[PDB]
Each structure stands twice: as C-alpha cells, then as structure tokens.
Amino acid sequence: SHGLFKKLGIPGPTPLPFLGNILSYHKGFCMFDMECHKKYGKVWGFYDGQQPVLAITDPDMIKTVLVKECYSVFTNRRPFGPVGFMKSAISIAEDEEWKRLRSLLSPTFTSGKLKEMVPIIAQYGDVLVRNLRREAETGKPVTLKDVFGAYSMDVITSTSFGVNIDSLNNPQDPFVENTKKLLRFDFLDPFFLSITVFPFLIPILEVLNICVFPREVTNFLRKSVKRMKESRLEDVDFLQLMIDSQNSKALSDLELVAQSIIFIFAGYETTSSVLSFIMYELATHPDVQQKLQEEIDAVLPNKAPPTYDTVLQMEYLDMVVNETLRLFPIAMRLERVCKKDVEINGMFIPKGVVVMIPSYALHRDPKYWTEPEKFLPERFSKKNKDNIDPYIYTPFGSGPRNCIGMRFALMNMKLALIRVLQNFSFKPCKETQIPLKLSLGGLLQPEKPVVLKVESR
Amino acid sequence: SHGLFKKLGIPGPTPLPFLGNILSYHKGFCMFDMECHKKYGKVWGFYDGQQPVLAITDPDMIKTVLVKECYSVFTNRRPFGPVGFMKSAISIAEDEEWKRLRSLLSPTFTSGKLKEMVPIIAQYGDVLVRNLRREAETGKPVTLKDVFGAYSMDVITSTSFGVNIDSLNNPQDPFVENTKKLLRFDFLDPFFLSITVFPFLIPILEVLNICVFPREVTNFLRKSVKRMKESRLEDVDFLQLMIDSQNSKALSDLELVAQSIIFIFAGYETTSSVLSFIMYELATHPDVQQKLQEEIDAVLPNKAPPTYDTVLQMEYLDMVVNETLRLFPIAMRLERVCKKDVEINGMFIPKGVVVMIPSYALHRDPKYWTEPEKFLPERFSKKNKDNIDPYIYTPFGSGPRNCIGMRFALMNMKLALIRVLQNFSFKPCKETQIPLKLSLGGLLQPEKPVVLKVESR
Ligand code: HEM
Ligand code: HEM
C-alpha cells in the first residue's frame, strides 16, 4: 500500500512500515498539515497506518469532491473504530442510509424550526449571565471552558429533550453527569493510534460489543429517551421533531436515539470551544470587543433581549464569529472516502483512498489571506466577503454532507455572545496565556484553559 | 515497555512506538549488533517490537547466563510464533519439559553413537565425490549450496531414518521433496516482522492450527515415521536410538516425531551453509587448501578412507573448521529469557527480558581478535587455542542448552571435507564473488551463491 503515491507521482512524507506517517503527528494534526502544505505544495499524500490519504488544496478540486461528486463517489467519511448501534448516527451512516437520514433530519434544522427554538436558547443565556455575575462580583478569574461548557450543555438538554437544568450548579444531576461524557474523540490518543496501526482489530471489538461511545452513557440515554417518548405519548425540542418525523423509511426508534446522542456529541464541546476562542480574541482585542458592544447596544438598546431577527441584523457580530472560525476551524480537516476509481480535475484517485481537505492549513495559508495569523474581522466585512472562496474557508464543511447543525450553532453562539456582552466586558488576567498556544494533541484547543477577568457593565 | 533501559541506565537505540528498533534490521542482524557494540559498548538494550532485549558482551556475565544460572533463571529461548505440536521439539521445549528431553536425547549424541554412524556418513561422502567428479570432468562451475545441500540431506535421511537416497540425482523423490522444505526461518521476513509487531496474534494462529513448520511436511514425516516404526517393530540411525529410548517419562510417540523433524531442521541448511563458507575460504586461500590437503594425505595416504579416529587426528582440519565458524557463526546470536528478577555480575535484569549474546559481533571484535576480518587458521593452533575464551567464541553456544548436535555436525563436515579434498582442488571462477559479501536478510549467508571451479587431483 505504501507505494501508492510514489506510483502516482504524488509527493508526500515517506512512510514507515506498519506506522505509515503517524509518527509525524507528534505535534498534532494542524502542524502536520501546515508543514506538508509548505513542503509539497498543492497536493500531497501520506499514510495513516496502511490507509492512504490524499490531501488536496485546489478550490476547484475541493468543490468536485465536496459538492459535484458527493453522491456518486465521495459520499462517506472514513471509519474510525467500533461503534455498535451508533452506526445509525447520521454522521457515521453511509450511502443510501445516510442519504435517507439526511432527508429525514433536514426539515428539523430549518430556520423556521430554529426561530422557534430561540426562546429556549435565550433562557439559558439568562442563566449564563446570572452565573457569570456571581463570579464577577467576587473578582475571581473565570475558566471559559467551564462556564461555556455549562452553557452549551444547558442549551443541549433543553433544545434536544426539554430537560431544564442549570448544569453549572447541578453537576451531579444524573442526566448532566451522563451527557457531559459525550466529548470529542482524540484520534491521537493511544487507543485510536493503536486501531490505526491495527485496524484488523475493529471487528473483534465490535463482536465483543466494545464501543467508542461509552455504553453506560448510551444505555442511560436510550432508556431516558424511551421514558420521555412514552410520557409525551401520550399526554419544540429536537426529540419532538424526530418523534413527529417517524409519524409518517421513517426513523427507527433505534435510529432516533442514535441521532439524539450524536447531536449532543456534535454540539457540546464544539460550541463550548468556539465560544472560548471567540472570547479570548475579544479579550485580547479590546477595540473589537468595544465595537461589538456598540453594535449590540445600537441594535438592542437598554439591554433588550436578543431575538432571531435582531441577531441576523448584527453584521460585526457575524464578522467576529467568522474570523474566529477562520483561525480556529475546530474540525481541522474534512474527509471523504473515494468509493470508485475516478479522474477529477486532471488527477487520478484510486478507489479506497481517503481524500482530505486541510481546512486549518487553508485557513492560515498566506497565499489566500493577508497576515493569516492575525485576528482581523474586516476580512469578513460586507465589502471583503465576496472575495472569500467557500472551498478555502470551510469551518462547517461544504456540500450535501456539510454541518447540518451550522445554522443552530451560529445562532446558539451569537445569542450567548450577545447576552454576555450586554452585561460584561472580558479582560485578560496575568494567568491569561498571551499569546494563546494550541494543544499538540488530536484536538484543536488551547494548550492551557482560557482564563479571563469578567467585569460588570 | 519502551522506557525500561532508560530507567535502568542502559544505553541503546531509542525505540519507535509499536516497532521498537526493528527498522534498524534493514541491513540484517549482524550489522545491527556490530553497530550497537561499537556505539554503546559492553552492554546495550533494544526492543523487538515491545520485547526488551539486553545484549551482553562480558565473558563473565555470559558464563553466568549460559552456564551458572541456566537451570534457575535462563533456561529457555524466546517464543517465535505458532508451532503446534512442534512445541515438543527439544529446541522449543521449556523448563522441566526441556530438561527431560535433553536427558532422554543426550545419550543419543555420545561419541560412542557417533562413531557407529560414521560408516553411514562416509558412504555419502563417496556419493558426494562421484557427483562432484561428474561436474569436474565437464569443466562447469559448481554451485556449492546445491552440491553440499544434497550431501547434507543424504546424511540426514540415512543417519536419521535409514532412508538411503542420492538426493542430488533424485530430487523428486517424495521423501526428499518434503525434507528439503525444512529450511531455517528468516526472522526478518514479512511474516515474522508482523508477528514481532503483533505478537498478540500468535494465539489466534495457534487455535486455527496455522504453524510455521509446514503442515504437509510434518504430516508426511509423521506418517512416514509411523510406517518405519511398525516395519522395524517388529522384524544405528537416530530413529532407532529414540525408538530404543522410549523402550523404558519416556519419549512420547508425538515427542519422538518432533525430535526427528527438528534434527533435520537443525542440521540441514546449517551444515550445508558452513561447508560452503569453508570451501569459499579454502578456494580463496590456496596455501591453506594445500596445507590441508597435505595433512589429509599424511594421515590417510593413497586416498585411504577417513575413520572416526583419523578425523580427530587432523589438527589443521580442526583449525580450518574452527576459523570458518569464527568468521561465520551462522546462529548469529544466542538468546535466553530471564524468568525471574535477578542481579548478575553487578547488573539488575528484570523478569521477562531477553538476554542476547551477540556471537557474530564478538567473533569479529578487534579487542579480542587481531585483524578480525581475516581468515587465519593459526588462531586455533595448539599453541594459540588456550588463549581463546569459550564465552567469546560461541559458534555452537555454551552450557547445558548448547548445540546438542555439535559433535555430529563437526564430524559430518570433517568427513565431507576430507573426502572432497582427497579427490579435488577447489578454485575461484570469475563468477566467484570475491570478496564474499553477506546477505542483508535474516540469515547468515552469502549475498550470491558461492560458485567454484572443481579440479580433479
Ligand atoms: C461551532 C460549532 C460546530 C462546528 C464548528 C461544526 C463543524 C462541523 C464540520 C466541519 C462538519 C463536517 C462537515 C463536512 O464533512 O463537510 C460537521 C458535521 C456535522 N455536524 Fe457540526 N459543527 C458544529 C456544531 C454542530 C451542532 C450544534 C450540531 C447539531 C446537530 C452539529 C451536527 C453535525 C452533524 C450531524 C454532522 C454530520 C453531517 C452529515 O454527515 O450528514 N454540529 N460539523
Ligand atoms: C555446523 C552446524 C551447526 C551449527 C553451527 C549449530 C549451532 C547451534 C547453536 C548456536 C545452537 C544454540 C545453542 C545455544 O543457544 O547455546 C544450537 C542448538 C541446537 N542444535 Fe545445532 N548447530 C549445528 C548443527 C546441528 C545438528 C547437525 C544438529 C542435530 C541434531 C543440531 C541440533 C541442535 C539442537 C537440538 C539445538 C537445541 C538444543 C537445546 O535446546 O537443548 N544442530 N545449534
């Protein structure tokens, strides 16, 4: 397998027996992709164990992969380990099963449904603010991941199940204790590297019902969901939307639970992390934070509560969120498996190769962005935004298999930022890491938790 | 596991995850051991996958391992893969099972038994000579491994089973076709490297009856042996010695067959290879070849047939054989597993570590041998031989688990050399590789087969 890119005349780091190139992950995924881009140019290939991965950076080729040939050739992501029934989660499902699930779930994420969820989201912005004020009146530095983590979970439990908890102050509530375990996978941890080198072990793990999603958590949520369903049946959240959908091919009961679980997984740590990065940037660029506070006060005088429509009115807020996601595209990479031999944009790609789009590297490419390391919201101004290629800037992916939750996530984050910035200004501590450094693990996160001073307005 | 030698303050090449140091075998075992000895000194540690291996070179420590603490601590070699019933072969057996087998088999290899086998061995020296003469009368270069391979097999089939074949001229005889498959393992081949990196797969292979000894061969020999046994029962070879032994704890029928098979394995390619190296050295040092021919003619005038006692009379023959085995110790390394935490000669060795004695590296160590790359039989002269440390010079190992076949092998080789040198002189071709280069694989063998001109005396 390790002779593939050599045979195709594609450059890339020379692989080692068994390992491929995984030893080059010692400084994390993003540094690897940046260094490869710099060394090899527009396309390169490497090996995750024995799995060939072809990295592409030409926006035309990216469009072909993510959009034009999504259904025919590049439909699925790569398998990553033993998943049991979570096989049915839309992010893991393949081919026609995926296409069916995306159809069934698409109406659930429309703006019309989002707009109806906003009062629920807004409520926990109030909770977030009350909790923040408690920490602002006692001038103690605040750990963002903790406070935005609780916010993220509060929005999840209410908008997905109508479970209303102040999780920051109720950490040992059984529901919170279980859902909080649905964190992102670290694909550079020993287990996932071992599976990468020994992928032939995954069926053995599956037959023994060993799953990368914690069984006690999925068991808890399966029986919780069944309780909720039959209390509702009979006598605004994602559960009810899905319950209504299978009220017709329609969603299996097991499929329903898989989606409830994956939505938590998809939105919990992702939202929290992006909010922490945004607040870090605002704290370290006071002028941006002030300008944003000025916009919010203009659109919503007298600390008026945010609404769906007023959120969409805030252009500078949009610019700040988009520029943070340029710097910190937490997915790092996008991937699709090539399901058949194809030739796209003049290049032959063999069946079975994983095609990868290195979002982080492209987001920080000097050839596409002036001073790419700098936080500059004007990049996304109404004037400049037309000049941004949607296949270079891909924090939510692109095409039919992009982030189905993108509108919700953006609304969720913006509602939080508005409420928080109406009430507080955030400033650096001396224990604030400046400049922020990224972890060298398999997740895009700060090396040390972001800690900030919170001051009442 | 990879932090062990670091923790003990023992030097050695820094291992890679999963692989340990096996990528350093790319130029073979012997080059690796030479380079480590040079770089790290008297002791060093490395990792075969996750298995720690401690290399030692102090003759006092070597004596402790191979002799003093053989029974208590360093009894067994390391496991190497799926072996099925060949588990019972004496070279593979462990602990009390080994100790029992060595006891049962020891009387079989006494000089008294050897002396009785010599007329049988001698017969195939005559066959070897007749076959060589056929190739000498038609001045075609001879490939040593082919001619000494056939000799080695002829001696094996007759001295182990009383099966009398001219294998050179009967290659498609079913017995020869099967026994010829019992070649030495190449532990650097893809299968054995894979097992080294994935040793957790060996039990899976065992439960499926996948064995590194070819099943069709062992099946053939098992049923051949059973035929022979019951033709002999009722109505001088190793089989009869073993048959007599179980005529008493006594050797199982399955144990008996395991030994018959392992003796072929142990003696077939080993004898052939050493004979080829010796003839290479004689051909490239005509003065040595002549002196040896002079000794043989003195001891056995008029091409007198060699006998057990006249062979032992030939001191220069002994020197030539011993010096070739110094240059080419085909086992390369000796190994023992440490079965309990011990401290020997001031050094702590943890349970489970493989202790390795790098025979090849010590045989070519400039600090023990003047001009170690040169073929100099006088090293082993009656005068100089006292100065040779038996823990530095170890072509047949040392101690209670040394080569049980050593006397036989030496007699076998000497009888062949005598008969051959009485009749022929061996000279280089232009297709003779000079200087000889060694293979970079996992076996100590010439890079290209040794080919020589054979001239009738
Ligand atoms: C700031 C927060 C988030 C970011 C940055 C983000 C980013 C992404 C990215 C990059 C992908 C891969 C798209 C591709 O491969 O082209 C993805 C997929 C997905 N995301 Fe999000 N996401 C976020 C929040 C959410 C939320 C709140 C949900 C709620 C349901 C969600 C649900 C999903 C699902 C289900 C997929 C797989 C879609 C499919 O395979 O059909 N994500 N997300
Ligand atoms: C020139 C030819 C040969 C050489 C260089 C050679 C070398 C060796 C070496 C280095 C060992 C390991 C000793 C140790 O670990 O200390 C060994 C073991 C052994 N050899 Fe030989 N050998 C040769 C021929 C033979 C022959 C003809 C036989 C016939 C039976 C034989 C049978 C064995 C057996 C059974 C063992 C394992 C002993 C035990 O574990 O108790 N070898 N040999």
Explain what you see:
Two copies of one chain form a homodimer. By secondary structure, chain A is α+β, with helices and mostly antiparallel strands. The first copy, chain A, has one domain: Cytochrome P450 (Cytochrome p450). In chain A, 47% of the residues lie in helices and 9% in strands. Chain A has helices at 4-8, 29-40, 59-68, 95-105, 111-136, 144-161, 174-179, 190-197, 202-207, 215-232, 238-245, 253-284, 286-299, 308-312, 315-327, 359-363, 406-423, and strands at residues 43-48, 51-56, 142-143, 334-337, 342-344, 347-349, 354-357, 424-428, 451-456. Chain A has a four-stranded mixed β-sheet. In chain A, strand 1 and strand 2 form a beta hairpin. In chain A, helix 12 (253-284) packs across helix 15 (315-327). The first copy, chain A, is globular, with a radius of gyration of 22 Å. Chain A binds chain B through residues 16-19, 23, 193, 197-198, and chain B through 16-19, 23, 193, 197-198. The complex binds protoporphyrin IX containing FE (2 copies). Residues 90-91, 102, 262-263, 266-267, 270-271, 274, 330-331, 334, 395-398, 401-405, 408-409 of chain A line the site of one protoporphyrin IX containing FE.
